[PDB]
Design a protein around this ligand. Structure first.
Ligand code: K
Ligand code: K
Ligand code: K
Ligand code: K
Ligand code: K
Ligand code: K
Ligand code: K
Ligand code: K
Ligand code: K
Ligand code: NA
Ligand code: NA
Ligand code: NA
Ligand code: NA
Lengths: 309, 309, 309, 309
């Protein structure tokens, strides 16, 4: 079976009521098509309202300097964008011209919001910030202060902060309930600091998120030997708010069984440079191995308890 | 008694200070009326300010090419939408014309914001996204890995993510305090992962939310037999943020006693298709039954503890 | 001593760097003054930029149909609001006119945002929604299912929802540390459901928030007799998001010692009406008394434990 | 080694994909340059689109009153800002003029959003509010009601509220894992009320945030003597939402070993003035010393337990 989440964040999942928020799907399209729809909508409302200026003018003979279809188009433009050159002016003759100018000039603002606000949000969409949030390429398992840990690194490239930033992790692997039920990609949260508000990040320079492999960890019975045998995947999620706006964003990444390295450890990145801190981003992803017992956390702890003198 | 929340989310509840935020009620109205008010406000400010252009012009004889009421209307329009055709131009004569152009042109922007921003928010309201978030039609109770569970499925139809997404559930049923007090629709939260951040969803492909029926569960003493006898309703709430904007949204649904099925289980939806995952949305709501003890979780556990060999 | 928070929410507290976000203070002013500043800023930029059109025209003799100060003002207006009547047109003569039109037309949009966006936010400020969120006028203490409770009611008048809505309460009273230190208005949080996500509200029809008076409660040793002797105040806070926008809001209220009624209980508000629920908002604030022991929760529990047969 | 966070909040840290959200970096620049780019973009699109009006007019001989380059520039301006003086008018001759007016007038709104919305956000950026949130200049350690506490004061200068406001603290100091691994600026959260929702602030008048120095505190074994020997730094973070908008903000500050005062205590700031509370902001930062044991919290508690009579 192939992975559920790519290293960059896109999922490998494929899926009537999409027109209950035509706006939500409007902001998704790539620029070129957004810029085309924007044109379409604008031109066709210049068409429709321009066609009604030609319908009432046909019954009258309100209108100054209008001739064919090529001229009735240029009046609807001077009105909706409120250009109004002054070559094509309006007069007092018909009642059907006064009330339709109102309808056009008002509905010109409604078309303005739907599009300008639309154009705003996509320029200002937060998913972009998540580009400059980065995860180590592998995760490691090595010892820390006595206890075995699953560790991955997290970084923020942009100098700006990410407010109320947090990290959570979900372990994904199929399982079978003792009752028979097979559950395809069963998600189960991994502890990465949630019981101590240690999962609340002060992300400035790159941090190593550590999940300790205790009794309640999924990695409790995985040993160095069993690890490559397993068929699991660790989804890593980082959420928080772009300091510069009120936008909330999410950056994701994944670790499949083969990308977790047993016995390794992260290369430091920090150096103090004459009154500032220098983050050597070259050593970010890089790791190195150190002496690391090959036993499962469950056994390590069992032998450590049997060592009571 | 009838239900508190409909399967789609609307509540069956009916309720001076509504004019302390005339804006909040302005965004509620259906489009046609919003589009009418928009017209009203725009036309009547063209009226008022146009009427004051006719009042000061009456005392003067500032004004170029103005005649009756049908012409004074077309000047206020060329000014507030800043059309300004150049047929009706302003001159240097009266002081009461210079300062009133300022008042109109400035208050033309104030009317613009109140309406354009108004038009923005409703196009961009989040309640819409909640349309494409969906709940299984029934909930089930069956065994999982030894312990009895109340389970309902949750789905997101749109390919876009829902950031910081979470699920919570409230059990609604009237009760009487031993002291006598009757409480009409007393709400009491149901555990659906809150003590482990398992209620924090990574909602991509459809998930089964499971509430285990332990000592602290309301369903602790409900057996298969008692269930249809009960008069309870489970409100299911899903909250989180639209990836595409900073909007927070809520999707709700309900389970009344008869819609909870004892002994059943959800049909899988996942299939791996040549390097992506295929979610067969047809089996979403569908369930099937399996061997499931008819005893209450309280008794099941009591007999399992008595089985100690 | 007088109270810290009024029944409506304003605090009784009085307090250089206020110009580090001149915007934040700009949205605070009442409408009339906001509407005046808006005028000021607009007129004075029409003045400044209009004065520079008169400075370069003085060195030239770029300019069509301009005379005195009363005419140079009407050109700056036709340019910044992009009215441009066509009576006062621009020509090719001087270089100092071409680049200044650019500077004005660009800085006309900068003045537009600062003001239009300003005008948007205040119309769309959330503090308003908090008007239609309401708290019972008194709080009560009576028994519930064996244990003594401090209870106040909460309501939402508007039919719209309040997403991710929550309630928290802080007990305010001065205290002296055994070491001598006197602390003026020491705040200490009261449990109103925080350890069970029962403080997470599904606020539709009016809810009674209950704080049980256990060992950890401040009201643990307050008896009916001692209550009127105490000098405490309960601040009640409700926070959450306006369904209609991404705004987060806060509604506050207070209970001073005299407004907490010992031995009373809230009048029900619910009635089921032919397929909807009718909330009789008249009985909202209203209470009534019932048999309620006059002893402190600490003693009640002590005697209940001594009753072990 | 020098500190990680300055007393005002800037960090002493220095750090391709920055063009995946050119918008995010657009809002960062200081005003003068923002105002220059705004000019650049506007002028160069007036250039490009103006140059295409000169290209199609060259193949024709659509155009009224156009001559050299100095005149073709003034047409593109009357069109994109929708000024349209009426001296330079459009006619029916060529098809390449009609469709290009559409392209310009539409892309004039796209350039409008990107810039006006840009201009909006920076005026409305939240980081500013964090200016008027303030931290005591030192932190103290003294006794409170028996137990030793690390205390710093927090204030909000602006009369407006900060919704859903919270305080958290991270202790920063390098450490070595018993396994050998040296960790440069290892962060570890300090308890400031997180297990009781006491870290949820009702920040109106200035509050003393207290971290009790218990077994789980980092300051458990630091005595008065050892404190000046240590090389630690306490980062203090305050997060929450600007009442006036939906913006979330963060105010930070730091305490290095030398700024924590052992044996001192904060000067009160509150006085009740004729029906309001007067906060004497002069005594905000100020402290004073009182009798305070010089032993480490670990020992204090050890001797208090040995005192059992
Ligand atoms: K215009
Ligand atoms: K115009
Ligand atoms: K014009
Ligand atoms: K917690
Ligand atoms: K928790
Ligand atoms: K927001
Ligand atoms: K004109
Ligand atoms: K919790
Ligand atoms: K908690
Ligand atoms: Na950063
Ligand atoms: Na999704
Ligand atoms: Na409601
Ligand atoms: Na305040």
């Amino acid at each position: 079976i192939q992975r559920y989440v790519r290293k960059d964040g896109k999922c490998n999942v494929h899926h009537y009521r999409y027109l209950t928020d035509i706006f939500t799907t409007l902001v998704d399209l790539k620029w070129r098509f957004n810029l085309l729809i924007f044109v379409m909508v604008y031109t066709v409302t210049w068409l429709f309202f321009g066609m009604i200026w030609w319908l009432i003018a046909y019954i009258r003979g309100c209108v100054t300097n209008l001739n064919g279809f090529v001229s009735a188009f240029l009046f609807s433009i001077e009105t909706e964008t409120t250009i109004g050159y002054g070559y094509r002016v309006i007069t007092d003759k018909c009642p059907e011209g006064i009330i339709l100018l109102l309808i056009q000039s008002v509905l010109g603002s409604i078309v303005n919001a739907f599009m300008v606000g639309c154009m705003f949000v996509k320029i200002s969409q937060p998913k972009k910030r998540a580009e400059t949030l980065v995860f180590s390429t592998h995760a490691v398992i090595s010892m820390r202060d006595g206890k075995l840990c699953l560790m991955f690194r997290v970084g923020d490239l942009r100098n700006s902060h990410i407010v109320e930033a947090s990290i959570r992790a979900k372990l994904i692997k199929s399982k079978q309930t003792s009752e028979g039920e097979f559950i395809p990609l069963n998600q189960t949260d991994i502890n990465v600091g949630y019981y101590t508000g240690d999962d609340r990040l002060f992300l400035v320079s790159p941090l190593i998120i550590s999940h300790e492999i205790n009794q309640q960890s999924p990695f409790w019975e995985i040993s160095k030997a069993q690890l490559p045998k397993e068929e699991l995947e660790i989804v890593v999620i980082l959420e928080g708010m772009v300091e510069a706006t009120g936008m909330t964003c999410q950056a994701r990444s994944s670790y499949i069984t083969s990308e977790i390295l047993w016995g390794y450890r992260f290369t430091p990145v920090l150096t103090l440079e004459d009154g500032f801190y220098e983050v050597d981003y070259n050593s970010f992803h890089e790791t190195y191995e150190t002496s690391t017992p090959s036993l499962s956390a469950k056994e390590l702890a069992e032998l450590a308890n049997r060592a009571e003198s």
